[PDB]
Amino acid sequence: MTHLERSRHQQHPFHMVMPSPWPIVVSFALLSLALSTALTMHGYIGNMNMVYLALFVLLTSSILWFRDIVAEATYLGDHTMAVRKGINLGFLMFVLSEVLIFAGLFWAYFHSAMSPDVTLGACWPPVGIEAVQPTELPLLNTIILLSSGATVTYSHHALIAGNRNKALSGLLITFWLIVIFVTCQYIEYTNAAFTISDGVYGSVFYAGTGLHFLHMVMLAAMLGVNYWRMRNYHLTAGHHVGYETTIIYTHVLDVIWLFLYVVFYWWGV
Amino acid sequence: GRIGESWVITEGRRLIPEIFQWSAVLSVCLGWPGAVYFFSKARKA
Amino acid sequence: ANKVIQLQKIFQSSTKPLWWRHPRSALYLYPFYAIFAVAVVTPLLYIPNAIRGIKAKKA
Amino acid sequence: VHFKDGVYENIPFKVKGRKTPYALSHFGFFAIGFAVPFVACYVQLKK
Amino acid sequence: MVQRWLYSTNAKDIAVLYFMLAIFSGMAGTAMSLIIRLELAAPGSQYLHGNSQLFNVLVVGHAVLMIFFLVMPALIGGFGNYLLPLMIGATDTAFPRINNIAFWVLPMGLVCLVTSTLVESGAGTGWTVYPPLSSIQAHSGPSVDLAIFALHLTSISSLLGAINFIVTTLNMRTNGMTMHKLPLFVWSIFITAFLLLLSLPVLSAGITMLLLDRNFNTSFFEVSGGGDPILYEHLFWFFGHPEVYILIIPGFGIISHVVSTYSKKPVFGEISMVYAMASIGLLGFLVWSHHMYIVGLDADTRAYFTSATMIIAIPTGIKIFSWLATIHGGSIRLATPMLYAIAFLFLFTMGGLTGVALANASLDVAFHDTYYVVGHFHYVLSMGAIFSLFAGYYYWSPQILGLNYNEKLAQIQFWLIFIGANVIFFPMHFLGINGMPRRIPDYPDAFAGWNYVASIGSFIATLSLFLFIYILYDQLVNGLNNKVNNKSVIYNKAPDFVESNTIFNLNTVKSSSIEFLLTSPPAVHSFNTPAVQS
Amino acid sequence: SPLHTVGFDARFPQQNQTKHCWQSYVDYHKCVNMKGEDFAPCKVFWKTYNALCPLDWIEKWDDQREKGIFAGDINSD
Amino acid sequence: TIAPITGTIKRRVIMDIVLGFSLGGVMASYWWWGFHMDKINKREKFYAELAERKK
Amino acid sequence: DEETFEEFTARYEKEFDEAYDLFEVQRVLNNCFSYDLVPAPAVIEKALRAARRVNDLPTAIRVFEALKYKVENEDQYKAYLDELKDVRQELGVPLKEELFPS
Amino acid sequence: NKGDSSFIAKGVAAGLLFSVGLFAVVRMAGGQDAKTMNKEWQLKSDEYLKSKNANPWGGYSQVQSK
Amino acid sequence: DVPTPYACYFQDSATPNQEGILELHDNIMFYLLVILGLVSWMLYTIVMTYSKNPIAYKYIKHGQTIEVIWTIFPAVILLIIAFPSFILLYLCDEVISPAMTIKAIGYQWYWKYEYSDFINDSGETVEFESYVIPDELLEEGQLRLLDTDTSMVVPVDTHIRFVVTAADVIHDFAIPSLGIKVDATPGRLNQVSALIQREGVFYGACSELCGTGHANMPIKIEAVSLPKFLEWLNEQ
Ligand code: HEA
Ligand code: HEA
Ligand SMILES: CCCCCCCCCCCCCCCC(=O)OC[C@H](COP(=O)(O)OCCN)OC(=O)CCCCCCCCCCCCCCC
Ligand SMILES: CCCCCCCCCCCCCCCC(=O)OC[C@H](COP(=O)(O)OCCN)OC(=O)CCCCCCCCCCCCCCC
Ligand SMILES: CCCCCCCCCCCCCCCC(=O)OC[C@H](COP(=O)(O)OCCN)OC(=O)CCCCCCCCCCCCCCC
Ligand SMILES: [Ca+2]
Ligand SMILES: [Cu+2]
Ligand SMILES: [Mg+2]
């Protein structure tokens, strides 16, 4: 093109973001969350509806932030190749941070199992705690997670090849698969023998599997918003970062559950 | 070659002031609490 | 429904902030602002009773 | 986006065109910063 | 002006806001330090009437304030968000709304820390928050929960800024810049971002386990229940020693720059400096259990950890000797950043040598929880972070503010904080080696002499701080006047000894970094066309 | 006696002795119900756990034994 | 003519390095052989007198 | 690669002959004197020629002043300024010490 | 420039004297001394330590006060 | 044995461990002083030689020889100071047939000493708590915050095994004249071994934060002779 016409554009690929209030809005919501839960833990607020309201404000502020970012990527078209490479690497580094949190939980488990305390009874699991059996329910959980991984990669390659109804059906099937995982995990927590207060086994067990449960609820939300954006034509054939982000999140959560399954059940029992 | 005074001479005349100045500066920077203990009552003076 | 081209036209042809450019923006934005103001006014309001010692009455 | 730039447009506060003196705000900021722990000590010693 | 600061999305406004919150909280931490040292002047309860709980509360307030709210916001936030997009030529850092939420999640961490101090009793657990002292049986009330939430909010800020810094310096470099052609401050904040990203998960894990023990009846750390308190020490120090290397490594970035620009010669082996910073960053995560040589680790474990801790003396020695090699043979222009660099060099070497004497697990029998370790860490933290901060301020503030500061006042401020910090932190080694324990509000009355001379030094340090915040006022109201008279230093680099003054005036800034050819206070969006480099 | 004690036990050569005292208490109580023929070799574990364990721990484990709460490998058989 | 005069900084660096190592060695030789040896001589003298009064 | 002394001499002779205005004469002289060697008198002779060719006196005084601050003795300065006596007499530059007599 | 070295020396001396003046003031607005900070108390402490012959080759005397 | 006003060194040794770690500390401070003298001389001679250099040698950049020399020089310095640290660590970690075992279990702001191997009447254990003497109860001559109610008395020239645990929070058991510092996690026991070579009194404190009463929590070990100790123990 000419020089007059080249003078009207960015001259550098990276996104020049408009000013937005959602950082200070999410920050104020997070402060009110921390304050209200520290005042409701110790009886200074009577009931939990304040903490419920603070969680609701934090959620809606995060949703409005994500609404602005899908607006900038879809309608404003500000995500070029450099910005796409940047948000891909940024999601990769956040995923590495969550993996390291789970490494901390695995350190707590391996310490409290390799050094069995004398009040527990010098055996892992402790005396009186019947462990969760591996083969009954978590085998079903881990095979539907592995099939969720196969289903997201089938739906992603069906998206790249152009086929719409195969990719939509793949993303719908894998979203219902991981909510079947969430439901089976809630069922396992409902009919389980020990509590979170039942010593360090219940402590680190429900800590690790509950943090993974929380990440799978987050992946449920991400697969839902990705199904909505694929249904309403937001995702192209060569331009989609929400999908690549959600499927690398799916595979990392699958690997975390594989390690959680093998250690916490096949080595815990 | 070797025009002038030797390197031993013309660098010793720079170093021998600097050894004494460095010893003074470090003995102030490290041995200042000796003055507080010296004037202190725990020397019984 | 493929509103992507039409929303590209609406969003690029607008002198409004980015959270206001959709036609349904007020429908989210007004109750969110009211609920946010309440949710950040109240736990700050419960700090004098926290530093005073008055726990919440169990009624 | 295009904001104003120059010698005093880089900072949040207002130094030159000002009704009160600047020294008022500039030392009140650091004074309440220095007196936050005295408020803390007063509350804990009153308790 | 509501938009530009509240709804901010460019890096420099976020940077000056980071610096303002950093210096506010640093004033508060210095006040808590003054009150601590005032109570520790003479034996017996002098000012706090008994009330060792308030002294412990001010100890954790001073510690957590000076670490997580002065040095980390200042060094990481303000200097990273000003120079890291600038010194690589990036337009505005990638994810600027993450860059804004990190700053705005900091001062509410300050708010909930202050309200932890105000509520029922205050967190009196030390800055390490060791159970069962920080558990619900010893510390009832909501205070340690709010201190934990302060640590969680600043952990969010550090991690999100670390992600932002990694993808900014990886993805958004200018066109001529390979990774090998980067500056040392950019490399330093890159390595610091990686250590933040790989450390703050274990801190968040251990702190949330502490919170779960406190309020949800679970037992990670309660012995009545099978829990083990040493797990918190392992988790917290796997954060903790990477944290102190995070605090020191931006100083290693700043000092390379002020030393190379005030010796008028480049850094000696700059790629070896990159390798040494990365070696220190890798070697941090392997040495974390030198802080707990006392708990009863195995002899082979301690014999490992003393060797692993001693191995980091080699790359820090390579850095400290390459700085001497940069200053050797140059032409020293002793402005105040050069004064802070020289004082950093000497006093950080002294703190590192006391740390090497602390690295041995047989001698940490004799020195653990004495004032010898506070001599070591206040030496490396105070000098290597505050002198780095003052060097960065007096180095970059004429450029990023357009207002020159008074130079005579800057040198009296440097000298006062130099001798005051020496007078406060040198007798701590004597108190420690004679067996004075740590975190005590009162002592046997054989420690009163060195406690008196250190409490004399604290007033010198606070006077130098009050002088520094006067230098700030004098810079902000008379900066252009300071340029037009001879009360400051206009040119950081003098002409060389052949160079005419008009030949200099056509080329008045000779730097190996971008930031000094930018206009005083720079453009709100500079780099329209990208900065090219061979 | 002029200053005798337990000595050096190779099964716990390291610094912490928490499993030493526990295993000695469990083995002293295991000598009573299982073997019951060597009362003076039963007193070796008695002197060892008596020298290593604190009195509060001995009282707590004795109450947990007498109430059945004791988590040790105790087979009355 | 003028013989080529080159390398003053190299001679200066190795002279400064060995002078600094010898200065620090003088400091440490004073430290050990005066202070540490004086404390050890006082302690060994006390234990000699203690064994003598135990005889 | 390290340059030998005569290679340095040839390179800075060529550089001072190719220099074309005052910025280049002062640049070539700055990184001529910022090595760990006093330059050979042919290099100083070319420096005085190149400062004459760009019609600037005080850099040709700065040659001798930088030579004074660069050389190691007080006798090698004499050996230099008597071996450049005819060149300095031909151009007519003073030394700084006989220009400001104090 | 020619007067600044003397001005920075006089400034750092003014800072030292002013800071120890402020230390004297807020020290004078302090609490009472400990009852064990006496010459006669510390002589009896030395007497007890000499009876127990503590610190035999070092110093055992705590006097330090008046 | 007791801290000294305006002191700068360790307290006087009473055991092979403390004199071992004092010898190791001086053997470390030797080489720390040679490199402190090197860095301080180099910094001083550099600033006072080149604050008045007009031409800066801007072509000194890589220099591989001193790079490999200052890489391998701290290696041998840390090797030299890590030889006796390994010898001392693996020496003081040994427990070789203790003639005595005493527990020192640290309760919340006091100590509980327990001579559980020994007798009071016939076979029963000896135990006593050791509170600090309060400031209102100090008769004239007692050290403040150091002279406790009941001292832990201990025979001389005999191996003692200290098994320290806690009750509430982490309390450290530290006597620096005896070279012992080992903390009390409430979960587990921790042993240390020390033999005392001379009679006298040795003071210490809780070297870990114990709440409000962390300051007033002293330790007093009175090393007496063996007939005097047996007289004290049959009296107790
Ligand atoms: C950031 C690290 C840092 C710094 C700089 C300091 C600086 C000081 N500290 Fe502290 N301190 C800690 C971190 C730090 N401290 C930690 C982690 C603990 C542990 C708590 C525990 O163990 O439980 C501790 C504990 C501690 C103790 C031990 C008490 C005890 O446990 O018994 C003492 C004793 O006097 C003390 C006092 C001081 C004093 C007088 C200063 C003086 O140096 C103050 C003078 C400093 C300044 C004047 C700084 C300048 C001010 C600025 C705002 C910078 C401005 C520059 C820019 C903005 C660019 N603090
Ligand atoms: C500024 C941050 C910082 C830095 C850089 C360091 C650096 C080092 N630290 Fe430290 N440290 C702290 C912050 C820091 N530390 C804090 C905050 C605590 C207390 C925590 C708490 O109690 O809560 C602490 C406590 C601490 C302990 C725990 C002791 C205890 O709690 O009982 C140990 C033990 O190994 C230690 C050792 C070291 C060593 C070997 C280095 C080395 O990295 C130093 C390297 C530098 C040099 C070695 C000097 C330069 C090199 C040369 C001049 C070459 C020649 C040298 C040789 C040949 C050796 N320090
Ligand atoms: C405090 C007293 C204020 C009195 C105001 C009276 C108003 C009457 C009218 C007077 C004129 C208007 C005044 C308003 C303007 C104003 O002053 O700015 C107001 C703000 C806060 O305002 P607020 O929300 O608290 O005000 C409530 C009413 N709106 O102050 C400040 O940030 C003070 C900041 C101190 C200076 C910090 C110095 C350090 C900066 C370092 C930067 C360099 C970084 C380099 C490294 C990266
Ligand atoms: C253990 C010793 C080292 C300790 C650490 C070093 C000290 C730290 C401070 C260093 C400051 C100077 C560095 C910049 C100099 C520079 O960069 O010089 C650059 C010059 C370039 O030479 P070139 O042009 O020939 O080669 C060009 C191609 N390389 O190389 C040198 O000068 C060589 C110097 C050799 C030094 C040998 C040291 C011998 C003494 C060892 C110790 C003996 C102790 C005896 C005690 C009785
Ligand atoms: C208590 C323990 C610490 C004690 C410290 C020493 C005690 C003295 C305290 C300070 C007194 C004030 C003097 C002001 C001097 C002045 O006025 O400087 C003016 C000078 C000269 O100027 P000019 O030659 O251009 O001409 C002016 C006349 N027309 O320029 C300088 O700045 C250079 C001198 C400072 C050198 C840099 C030092 C940086 C810190 C080093 C840290 C230690 C490293 C060495 C370790 C061995
Ligand atoms: Ca006191
Ligand atoms: Cu560390
Ligand atoms: Mg400790």
PDB file of N, CA and C in Angstrom, chain J residues 214-236:
ATOM      1  N   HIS J 214       7.629 -14.816  75.393  1.00  0.00           N
ATOM      2  CA  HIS J 214       8.821 -15.356  74.753  1.00  0.00           C
ATOM      3  C   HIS J 214      10.094 -14.784  75.354  1.00  0.00           C
ATOM      4  N   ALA J 215      10.043 -13.541  75.833  1.00  0.00           N
ATOM      5  CA  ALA J 215      11.225 -12.928  76.426  1.00  0.00           C
ATOM      6  C   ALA J 215      11.576 -13.575  77.755  1.00  0.00           C
ATOM      7  N   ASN J 216      10.624 -13.636  78.678  1.00  0.00           N
ATOM      8  CA  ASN J 216      10.885 -14.160  80.012  1.00  0.00           C
ATOM      9  C   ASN J 216      10.701 -15.672  79.983  1.00  0.00           C
ATOM     10  N   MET J 217      11.704 -16.348  79.465  1.00  0.00           N
ATOM     11  CA  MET J 217      11.686 -17.797  79.434  1.00  0.00           C
ATOM     12  C   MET J 217      13.120 -18.307  79.474  1.00  0.00           C
ATOM     13  N   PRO J 218      13.817 -18.183  80.594  1.00  0.00           N
ATOM     14  CA  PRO J 218      15.252 -18.457  80.585  1.00  0.00           C
ATOM     15  C   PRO J 218      15.563 -19.901  80.908  1.00  0.00           C
ATOM     16  N   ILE J 219      16.808 -20.298  80.676  1.00  0.00           N
ATOM     17  CA  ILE J 219      17.288 -21.634  80.992  1.00  0.00           C
ATOM     18  C   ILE J 219      18.524 -21.480  81.860  1.00  0.00           C
ATOM     19  N   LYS J 220      18.592 -22.243  82.945  1.00  0.00           N
ATOM     20  CA  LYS J 220      19.720 -22.176  83.869  1.00  0.00           C
ATOM     21  C   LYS J 220      20.199 -23.597  84.136  1.00  0.00           C
ATOM     22  N   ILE J 221      21.339 -23.963  83.565  1.00  0.00           N
ATOM     23  CA  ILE J 221      21.941 -25.268  83.802  1.00  0.00           C
ATOM     24  C   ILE J 221      23.101 -25.077  84.761  1.00  0.00           C
ATOM     25  N   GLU J 222      23.023 -25.724  85.907  1.00  0.00           N
ATOM     26  CA  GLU J 222      24.030 -25.609  86.947  1.00  0.00           C
ATOM     27  C   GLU J 222      24.859 -26.881  86.925  1.00  0.00           C
ATOM     28  N   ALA J 223      26.050 -26.808  86.348  1.00  0.00           N
ATOM     29  CA  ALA J 223      26.935 -27.964  86.323  1.00  0.00           C
ATOM     30  C   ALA J 223      27.649 -28.052  87.659  1.00  0.00           C
ATOM     31  N   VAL J 224      27.342 -29.096  88.418  1.00  0.00           N
ATOM     32  CA  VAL J 224      27.962 -29.339  89.708  1.00  0.00           C
ATOM     33  C   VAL J 224      28.779 -30.620  89.628  1.00  0.00           C
ATOM     34  N   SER J 225      29.492 -30.914  90.708  1.00  0.00           N
ATOM     35  CA  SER J 225      30.255 -32.144  90.788  1.00  0.00           C
ATOM     36  C   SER J 225      29.335 -33.320  91.081  1.00  0.00           C
ATOM     37  N   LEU J 226      29.868 -34.529  90.904  1.00  0.00           N
ATOM     38  CA  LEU J 226      29.011 -35.712  90.946  1.00  0.00           C
ATOM     39  C   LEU J 226      28.542 -36.115  92.346  1.00  0.00           C
ATOM     40  N   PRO J 227      29.348 -36.070  93.424  1.00  0.00           N
ATOM     41  CA  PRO J 227      28.739 -36.266  94.748  1.00  0.00           C
ATOM     42  C   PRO J 227      27.779 -35.165  95.134  1.00  0.00           C
ATOM     43  N   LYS J 228      28.052 -33.923  94.735  1.00  0.00           N
ATOM     44  CA  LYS J 228      27.095 -32.856  94.983  1.00  0.00           C
ATOM     45  C   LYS J 228      25.833 -33.048  94.159  1.00  0.00           C
ATOM     46  N   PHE J 229      25.960 -33.596  92.948  1.00  0.00           N
ATOM     47  CA  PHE J 229      24.773 -33.851  92.140  1.00  0.00           C
ATOM     48  C   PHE J 229      23.942 -34.983  92.713  1.00  0.00           C
ATOM     49  N   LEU J 230      24.596 -36.055  93.159  1.00  0.00           N
ATOM     50  CA  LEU J 230      23.870 -37.177  93.738  1.00  0.00           C
ATOM     51  C   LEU J 230      23.215 -36.783  95.052  1.00  0.00           C
ATOM     52  N   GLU J 231      23.867 -35.901  95.817  1.00  0.00           N
ATOM     53  CA  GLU J 231      23.241 -35.331  97.003  1.00  0.00           C
ATOM     54  C   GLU J 231      22.017 -34.503  96.641  1.00  0.00           C
ATOM     55  N   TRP J 232      22.110 -33.688  95.582  1.00  0.00           N
ATOM     56  CA  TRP J 232      20.954 -32.907  95.137  1.00  0.00           C
ATOM     57  C   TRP J 232      19.829 -33.806  94.653  1.00  0.00           C
ATOM     58  N   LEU J 233      20.174 -34.908  94.000  1.00  0.00           N
ATOM     59  CA  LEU J 233      19.161 -35.749  93.387  1.00  0.00           C
ATOM     60  C   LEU J 233      18.458 -36.607  94.428  1.00  0.00           C
ATOM     61  N   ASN J 234      19.195 -37.088  95.430  1.00  0.00           N
ATOM     62  CA  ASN J 234      18.540 -37.786  96.530  1.00  0.00           C
ATOM     63  C   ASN J 234      17.792 -36.818  97.434  1.00  0.00           C
ATOM     64  N   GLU J 235      18.195 -35.545  97.454  1.00  0.00           N
ATOM     65  CA  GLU J 235      17.430 -34.541  98.182  1.00  0.00           C
ATOM     66  C   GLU J 235      16.139 -34.202  97.451  1.00  0.00           C
ATOM     67  N   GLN J 236      16.178 -34.211  96.126  1.00  0.00           N
ATOM     68  CA  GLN J 236      15.041 -33.822  95.308  1.00  0.00           C
ATOM     69  C   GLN J 236      14.017 -34.940  95.247  1.00  0.00           C
TER      70      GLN J 236
END
